[PDB]
Design a protein around this ligand. Structure first.
Ligand SMILES: Nc1nc2c(ncn2[C@@H]2O[C@H](COP(=O)(O)OP(=O)(O)O)[C@@H](O)[C@H]2O)c(=O)[nH]1
Ligand SMILES: [Mg+2]
Ligand SMILES: [Mg+2]
Length: 386
């Protein structure tokens, strides 16, 4: 039915993210229905669990006339880091809250940086606490500083919608300020496009298993991650070895012969021109020339604290864990930032990883870091280096 969009409020502590989340729910409920949430209900965020990682996050839901929004708001900076790296849902857009009285602060920069790294594709700005600013030149200055900051991190700062408002005075009922929250919800709808459907994206099937129908050839099984594979279409086996080229001779779903396989479907893809022995764990089926195998990438990673079931001790330069991309662990070597000798449990770092085998990889791809079979961290491919 109506499109689902994943959003959230980012920005420095005390800039008014929680008050804004409340003001969004309240004003949108007061004008065209829904349930209004109080400041207190969003402020004391419950503890959420993402495979051992503990994150304090408030999940609020609100509707505009044409869209349904699942909104994330976190109490502290640490939760934002965790949520952007390992959180339940990847943001389709973010609302960056900047207090006009402070202007951009260290966490403002950090969240913009993380958002770029993690692939948050759109940012809208709410210039908060305007009820406290009497100097228009001060507002223009803050607004210019924010546009420059966004542009520095490859966001289109010159084209970014910036709403001047007051989350407090709007929760309070002041209609002149409540107009600006509707202006903000308007930009959520107009500026964040509906996220691309999995079925529309180029074909990708992570290979979960391989069998060989007698007389029909090699069957590669898995859940179609994206797009459609039609019988007769050319495919590439991208992964652990030199990329191979084949043709889909059939698609099967529990003995049912299909003409195609679509995203979200569990299917058997038949490849007449390949043998089982040529199929390796970590490999992927994909639309030729849509995904490249890489060994080297830049990632933003979060290391679990001992409390979260992770390490108790730090790791160093020679750390060689397993990187679980989609179906298998691949060992990698790590390059830490210049000046960094160790990484503590509970920390986030920018890591340059070199895998021992190439993996079909695109920016934004999430992985798990495992030592043995135990999860020690989670990460996101920020940049593919080769
Ligand atoms: N003057 C003013 N105070 C505000 C506004 N929005 C929030 N506040 C206050 O700023 C403080 C921090 O806001 P809050 O939403 O809890 O910040 P957060 O840490 O970013 O979530 C609280 O004392 C709020 O009452 C606003 O627009 N104007
Ligand atoms: Mg808050
Ligand atoms: Mg720490």
């Amino acid at each position: 039915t109506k499109p689902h969009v994943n959003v959230g409020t980012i920005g420095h502590v005390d800039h008014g993210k929680t008050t804004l989340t409340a003001a969004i729910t309240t004003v949108l409920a007061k004008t065209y229905g829904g349930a209004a949430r109080a400041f207190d209900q969003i402020d004391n965020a419950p503890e959420e669990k993402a495979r051992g990682i503990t994150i304090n996050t408030s999940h609020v839901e609100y509707d505009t006339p044409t869209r349904h929004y699942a909104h994330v708001d976190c109490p502290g900076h640490a939760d934002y880091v965790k949520n952007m790296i390992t959180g339940a849902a990847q943001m389709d857009g973010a609302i960056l809250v900047v207090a006009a009285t402070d202007g951009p602060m260290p966490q403002t920069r950090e969240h913009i940086l993380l958002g770029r790294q993690v692939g948050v594709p759109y940012i809208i700005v709410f210039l908060n606490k305007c009820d406290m600013v009497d100097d228009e030149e001060l507002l223009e200055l803050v607004e210019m500083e924010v546009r420059e900051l966004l542009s520095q991190y490859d966001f289109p700062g010159d084209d970014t919608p910036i709403v001047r408002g007051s989350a407090l005075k709007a929760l309070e009922g002041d209609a002149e300020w409540e107009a600006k929250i509707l202006e903000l919800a308007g930009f959520l709808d107009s500026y964040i496009p509906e996220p691309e459907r999995a079925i529309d994206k180029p074909f990708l099937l992570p290979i979960e298993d391989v069998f060989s129908i007698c007389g029909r050839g090699t069957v590669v099984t898995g859940r179609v991650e994206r797009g459609i594979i039609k019988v007769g279409e050319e495919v590439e086996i991208v992964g652990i070895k030199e990329t191979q080229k084949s043709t889909c001779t059939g698609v099967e779903m529990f003995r049912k012969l299909l003409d195609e396989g679509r995203a979200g479907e569990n299917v058997g893809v038949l490849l007449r021109g390949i043998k089982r022995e040529e199929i390796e764990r970590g490999q992927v089926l994909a639309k030729p020339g849509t995904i490249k195998p890489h060994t080297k990438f830049e990632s933003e990673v979060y290391i679990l604290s001992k409390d979260e079931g992770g390490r108790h001790t730090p790791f160093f330069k020679g750390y060689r864990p397993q990187f679980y991309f989609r179906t298998t662990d691949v060992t990698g070597t790590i390059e830490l930032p210049e000046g960094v000798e160790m990484v503590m449990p509970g920390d986030n770092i920018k890591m340059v990883v070199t895998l021992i085998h190439p993996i079909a990889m695109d920016d934004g791809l999430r992985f798990a870091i495992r030592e043995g079979g135990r999860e020690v961290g989670a990460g996101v491919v920020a940049k593919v280096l080769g």
